[PDB]
Amino acid sequence: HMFGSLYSDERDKPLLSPTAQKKFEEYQNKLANLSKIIRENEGNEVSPWQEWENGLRQIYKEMIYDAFDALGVEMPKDMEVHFAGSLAKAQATEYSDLDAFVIVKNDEDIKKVKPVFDALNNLCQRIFTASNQIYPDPIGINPSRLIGTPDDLFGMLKDGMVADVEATAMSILTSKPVLPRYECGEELRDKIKQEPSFSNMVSAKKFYNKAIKDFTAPKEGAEVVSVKTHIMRPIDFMLMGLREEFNLYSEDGAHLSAPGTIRLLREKNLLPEEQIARIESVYNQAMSKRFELHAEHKKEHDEMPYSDAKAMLDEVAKIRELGVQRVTRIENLENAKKL
Amino acid sequence: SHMDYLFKLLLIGDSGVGKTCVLFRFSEDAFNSTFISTIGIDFKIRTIELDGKRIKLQIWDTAGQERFRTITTAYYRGAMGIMLVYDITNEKSFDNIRNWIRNIEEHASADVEKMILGNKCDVNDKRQVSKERGEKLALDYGIKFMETSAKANINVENAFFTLARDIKAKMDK
Ligand SMILES: Nc1nc2c(ncn2[C@@H]2O[C@H](COP(=O)(O)OP(=O)(O)NP(=O)(O)O)[C@@H](O)[C@H]2O)c(=O)[nH]1
Ligand SMILES: OC[C@H]1O[C@H](O)[C@H](O)[C@@H](O)[C@@H]1O
Ligand SMILES: OC[C@H]1O[C@H](O)[C@H](O)[C@@H](O)[C@@H]1O
Ligand SMILES: OC[C@H]1O[C@H](O)[C@H](O)[C@@H](O)[C@@H]1O
Ligand SMILES: [Mg+2]
């Protein structure tokens, strides 16, 4: 067959044209340079994972502008692109997936814009096949699957039109704007929080209980544990719980990172310092470990020896005890016993 | 959480002068030593108090890269305050301040507050632009001037509060 354009499907066009290939390599070099910049400046007051999210957001934005230019499509002014997952929280590693979705103001923008995001998914997939990075999940959060008006996307959740409503709802709620455009995102999040049938799946109690009951401690005698399942997930849900309880929000998504939440908990003295410091300490230890593990294996490697995880697991257990007290105090607050 | 005013601020200047680091210092009280060039336009939110009034600062951080200048220019109209940043170690970046000023005059609102920041004032051993030349160019355009350091945390807070004060004084009358 024939050479592929930069936005060709690699299954149909394994070989890029000489022009497309030079541009593909430019993107690969940007990702490689970003990893190199992180290593060289070890001990910077900006964490490796905060630096990665910053670098990757600039790279992805450049891919978006390049793609609109290449396909001869003008970028609508009222179109929003949002990061979801670890990237939205600025705790994605180099081998994390690239979860993004698109909110448009008008339904007719979709026909104009969806081809550009199909093109971008092809490029991202080709990069994934080459360096095992920026995976666009075809059954998850990608701008080709999740594109529409706030009404459309809320409709997907309210009706059946997506498998795992709860996980898509979590993704949309913990999303961060990539462009300086956030109002449609706000409208979408307010519709999800409005929906009576979503009432208790979006509550602080629910998020605290996921940290306590879902993402539970490793079994006794375990030799192996997951820095994701047993440490980073419980922390994530504890922080979602606190953000919901205290209405913590920034239009720029600054609240979604652990340090962002911790900054706000400290500013407003919303939690005792001892407890904030524990969450902060285990977050930094776990993300240092998780960032190292992925870079070393060049893939999502979350398993580590129980013995290496022991200090973090014990702090995570204290954080769960805290979480149980918050759920009780929330139930007790809604009851309001007098005398 | 209460808001009395929303001030729309714009950072403009050559790629590499430290617009992103000036805002990073203001918004997160940290310094990033690495150079990750801004693509299109970024924004940070920070609420401040002036005269017992809550002022939400919506701060647009523009690409200095020439490529994004059509996108960048479109924001001039909406800006209530504009920071013009040059780098005291880069003569070329100071020389372009007159061009940046001409572009504000052409595309910005008639009564937009302006401030010139001579950034990287911690790097005295590589200085190419004397402080007085900065003050002199600023005085000639009747625009307020400060030397700043995102790294050494010098005049970053003062710059943003002084620009916000000038905006507030203008619209209070
Ligand atoms: N010594 C010193 N270096 C600084 C200072 N401010 C920024 N820098 C450095 O200058 C480089 C560029 O800073 P950056 O904020 O990215 O510049 P920018 O104007 O946003 N660039 P662009 O327009 O391309 O987005 C980085 O290496 C940064 O660490 C400062 O006050 N002092
Ligand atoms: O880092 C991504 C995180 O986002 C949300 O909290 C999700 O519920 C979960 O997938 C994860 O904890
Ligand atoms: O009210 C604050 C909360 O509102 C929404 O749930 C947002 O998705 C969440 O990030 C934020 O912390
Ligand atoms: O604002 C006072 C400043 O004056 C000069 O710019 C110096 O280089 C700087 O170090 C000092 O702090
Ligand atoms: Mg920048």
Delineate the domains of chain A, giving CATH numbers in brackets. Answer: 18-198 (1.10.357.170), 204-335 (1.20.120.1520)
Residue whose C-alpha is closest to residue A144's, from A88, A101, A80, A175: A101
Where does chain A have alpha helices with state H?
Answer: 18-40, 48-70, 85-88, 108-131, 150-158, 165-173, 183-194, 204-209, 233-245, 258-267, 273-297, 306-335
Q: Locate A155 and state its tokens.
A: 């409709």
Q: Does A270 touch chain B (CB under 8 A)?
A: no
The data reach a resolution, in angstroms, of: 2.1
Q: Does A41 touch chain B (CB under 8 A)?
A: yes
Method: X-ray
Query: d(Cα A183, Cα A135) in Å, to the nearest integer?
Result: 27
Measure B7 CA to ligand 4 centroid, in angstroms: 28
* Whether A241 contacts A204, CB under 8 Å: yes
Provide DSSP, A282-306. HHHHHHHHHHHHHHHHTS---EEEH
Q: Please report where in the chains the tokens 């081809």 appear, as a residue.
A: A115
CB atoms near residue A233 (< 10 Å): 17
Q: Which amino acid is at B125?
A: D
Q: Does B27 touch chain A (CB under 8 A)?
A: yes
Q: Does A220 touch chain B (CB under 8 A)?
A: no
Q: Whose CA is nearest to atom 4 of ligand 4?
A: B147
Domain boundaries, chain B: 1-173
Query: d(Cα B143, Cα A59) in Å, to the nearest integer?
Result: 35
Ligand with minimal distance to B21 CA: 1
DSSP 8-state class, residue A75: P
Angle of helix A273-297 relative to helix A233-245, nearest 10 degrees, comes to: 140
Find the CB nearest A41 among B34, B38, B43: B34
Measure A187 CA to ligand 3 centroid, in angstroms: 12
Q: Please report where in the chains the tokens 């939690």 appear, as a residue.
A: A271
Residue ranges lining ligand 4, Cβ < 6 Å: B 121, 124, 131, 147, 154-155
Task: Write the Ramachandran bin of A271: left for phi over 0, alpha for psi from -120 to 50, otherwise beta.
Answer: beta
Cα–Cα distance list, A59 to A40, A101, A125 (Å) = 19, 16, 15
Q: Mutation target for B interface from A27, A33, A42, A46: give the one with most B CBs within 10 A.
A: A46
Chain A contact set for B1 (CB, 8 A) = 247
